[PDB]
Nucleic acid binder design. Sequence first.
RNA 1: AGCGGCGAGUACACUGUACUUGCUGCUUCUUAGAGGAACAUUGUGUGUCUAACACAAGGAAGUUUAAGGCAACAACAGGUCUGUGAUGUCCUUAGAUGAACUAGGCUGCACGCGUGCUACACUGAUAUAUAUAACGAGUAAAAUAUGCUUGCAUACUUUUCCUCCGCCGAAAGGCGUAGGUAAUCUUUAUCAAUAUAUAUCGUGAUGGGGAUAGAUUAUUGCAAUUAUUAAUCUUGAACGAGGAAUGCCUAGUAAGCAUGAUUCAUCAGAUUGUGCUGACUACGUCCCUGCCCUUUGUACACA
Lengths: 98, 154, 138, 41, 48, 128, 180
Amino acid sequence: IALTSKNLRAIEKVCSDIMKGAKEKNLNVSGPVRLPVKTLRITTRKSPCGEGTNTWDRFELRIYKRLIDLYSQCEVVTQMTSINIDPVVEVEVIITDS
Amino acid sequence: RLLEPVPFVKTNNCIKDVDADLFIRSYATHLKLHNKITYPKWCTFVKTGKGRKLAPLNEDWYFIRASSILRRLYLHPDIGVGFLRRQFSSKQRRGVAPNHTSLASGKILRSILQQLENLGYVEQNPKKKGRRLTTKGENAINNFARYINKKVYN
Amino acid sequence: KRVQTFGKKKTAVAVATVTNGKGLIKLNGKNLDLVEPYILKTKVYEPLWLIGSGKLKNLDIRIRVKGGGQTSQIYAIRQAIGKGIISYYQKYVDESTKKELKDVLLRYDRSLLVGDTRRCEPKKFGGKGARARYQKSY
Amino acid sequence: KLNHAVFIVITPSAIAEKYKVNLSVARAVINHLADSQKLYT
Amino acid sequence: VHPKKYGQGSRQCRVCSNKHAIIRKYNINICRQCFRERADIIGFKKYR
Amino acid sequence: QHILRILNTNVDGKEKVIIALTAIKGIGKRMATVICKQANVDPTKRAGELTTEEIDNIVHIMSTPTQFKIPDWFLNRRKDLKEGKNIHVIANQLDSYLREDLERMKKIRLHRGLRHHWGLRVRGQHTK
Amino acid sequence: DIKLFKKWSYEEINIADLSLVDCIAVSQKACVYTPHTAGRYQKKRFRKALCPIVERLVNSMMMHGRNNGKKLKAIRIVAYAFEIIHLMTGENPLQVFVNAVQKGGPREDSTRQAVDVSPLRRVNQAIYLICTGARNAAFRNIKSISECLAEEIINCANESSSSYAIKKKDEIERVAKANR
RNA sequence: AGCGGCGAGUACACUGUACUUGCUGCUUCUUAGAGGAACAUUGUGUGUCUAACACAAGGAAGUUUAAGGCAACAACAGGUCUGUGAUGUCCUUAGAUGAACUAGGCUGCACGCGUGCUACACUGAUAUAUAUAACGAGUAAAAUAUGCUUGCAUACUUUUCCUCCGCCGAAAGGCGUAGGUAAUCUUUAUCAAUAUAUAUCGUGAUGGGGAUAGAUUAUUGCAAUUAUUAAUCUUGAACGAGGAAUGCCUAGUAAGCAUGAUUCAUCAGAUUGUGCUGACUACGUCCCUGCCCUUUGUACACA
């Protein structure tokens, strides 16, 4: 179960809900995964025309994604996620046994 | 001169414990003495790299390169022609245009590795795709390193 | 018995692990001697004279050195070995000598214990130079 | 303009200034007498 | 006609319909003029 | 001992024996080196002990080296499209064959030839 | 303990004029085997003088056209110069170089009237004049820059007329005499 | 991703070590979610004892710790209607001022000025190799067969990014596959250069240096002639540290050295970022230049 987004508050709240539900269901859960940040940066020129001092500006997009694992029913985990997840976050599922 | 007072307890169980710079020269000397490999005569008119632009002007550069290759095989046992070219990359001057890095010629390295494979010092396998040292070669190079260590110590 | 420590300074990060042994000190597959720079070899050696080889004769410290420039690696390994030896003194072998150990390390310098935060700044606008720009033509 | 040769304190520059010779032939004569830059004996 | 899937003629800006100053960076397929104002809504926020 | 003068200058008597045959011609230092390696002249010695035996060995070596082991691709202006194959012809004959090569271009008289004859760079010297 | 290039500990230093000693600021803190250290000098003013005199020599030798910034070979050239100096004259290379710096610096300069020279820039100008002499000696003087710089150092130390730094000092003092 | 422990060890010591196989006691270390930590902090001082400033110390953090961005009011009749189906007015449309297609140009040059690229060497020209980083960036098309007669139509897989490897070719490049929609494959227990230590040379327009040609070989693209790009051999100018003039710049930063990204089918000598080697010299001054404030004189106010 890996989640991905661009802002940190959404991933924080949904991961909080995820491990709260994990503690509720007292199931085999792997530790949290805290990946290094991945940034998308482009630099573009201002001044739509060709006149004036050459001035540029830079951008940044910090993409945030983490991983977790749970030993539970796929249907029940997908329901408990889809109940309390914001569609702005993308989540995928991988099951574990031992 | 090159020796220094060692302040810790060594192991000297393999070849990395000995200095590489002199170990490759010692292996080149042994290679010339025993004539394990050929020259080969086929490469005596080709520069090592595009940006080298000059002849090696030593007559033993094949032995030097082979000693270097074996040092590489031991130090990192998963190599390739691309990795070797990258490590052997040197500068190349384009005249007026600025100098750029450039890789070495691949045929010389391919010939060297084929010669080593024929000698059996290095082998190939799907698992561990890169060139690896055999067990017999491992023990032989271990004893060679110990011999060089004893020679340069006592 | 065994404890792991780290040294972070400049671009390079070095890690050490001091265990019980007979004085086996290793740098990756190599040792502290085959780095190349005999100038920085003694820089790494300075803790050996500051503390003592007879006590290193009873401790084995493995070291992994990886990334960054050669000077940064030397400085990082110095930091890592200093922190590892101070931790091993605080934990296993003895503390009373550790009291003088800190007193001697800090007497020599503050650089061995803690690295520096000196790093490159984001190169600015205007031209090739960080603080310099293209030549002005009127 | 070079005019030195090999035809007529063992360090290269010292021998070169003593015998008015090139550095290469100076090093050659040094090796001849004894039998890049290194610390002196 | 002489169309092709190569060169600058195979693509252009998706707003201005111009072939000048088009960035393929992460396949945005946009012009700099319109991108510099669409950046905020796209998520491109100038920070440092 | 020193000062041996031949068709080309060889005043490099105080210099190295390899430079003795690399400075005479082929300043690219690659044809000269291949000629040297076919000569089997050691580089340790200097040019002050050069033998006329070695000089005649050179004068036999450069004489159409295609029979020798020098590869086709190494040699100068290999194809030089005609009924046959040309070769580097050292110094005086080199310049004579280059005179042939720039006299055979004036009847081609194409864009590049007329541009150079007017005194303009083949790729453009960009005086602009 | 510490030995420069594993050769000289310079346990003896000439007193100079009691100001050049602090100007060079060579001591156990400044001791090193090879030049091109990592010392900082742009957080203060005193640290700039705290950089060792040999370090200033190696990092001032580098200015000539394409050769700019090659301070690894500045290390090489100063090491070779020390090696050749030590037996061209029996004196310690560092010591004789120190006396050379001591007597190679102008003391009064008449720019605009005359002004006494501070010890810091007296040392800096002595080093600058030595560097210029070594550069003009690498200019069309047959011999290698090793011998050029070594000869300049020994000539400055023994106060002979063939030294470009001393000639420039004489020119400056001649301007001083003409003005005054 | 790291730490180990043991499962069998490959050679060495003696009463663990370099290289491999797999699972998991653990998460400072490879890392980020959050927060804290640095506020002239503490004293010895300068100050109308208020605002301001120094020394020394702990500390990674004492010039806001530094570098990044947001830039008021008012103005230029500054640039752009060639960025937009943002736009008024005027003008035009079959011999179009709409679109497509063939070929052609901004790459040509007495000259000038910049942006910039490579030299004048021995602090370097040259051959060996160890110690090397980070931002980075990466997936409506091929070919096969059939029918007609290499070309046209149709059915099939995925070729259409970075690529490792193993081969062929000096090289350029070519062939077949592992991997990756990406901290997993390039590559990352590690990719450049200034190195390095030993060696040829030892300042001789020299071997430096590369303006300079033909001959070519391969790729990109239907198309490279205007030698796009490109390895190979021959070609051998200026240049001995630099005219009148004139530009830029105070700390992991000047400069040197490379290199990632943008445009890109192919083409950096352009722009923008990244890093290495980490220098000669400040805690200032108004002398020039350019601003800001006050007073003053004006016959100026498009100043």
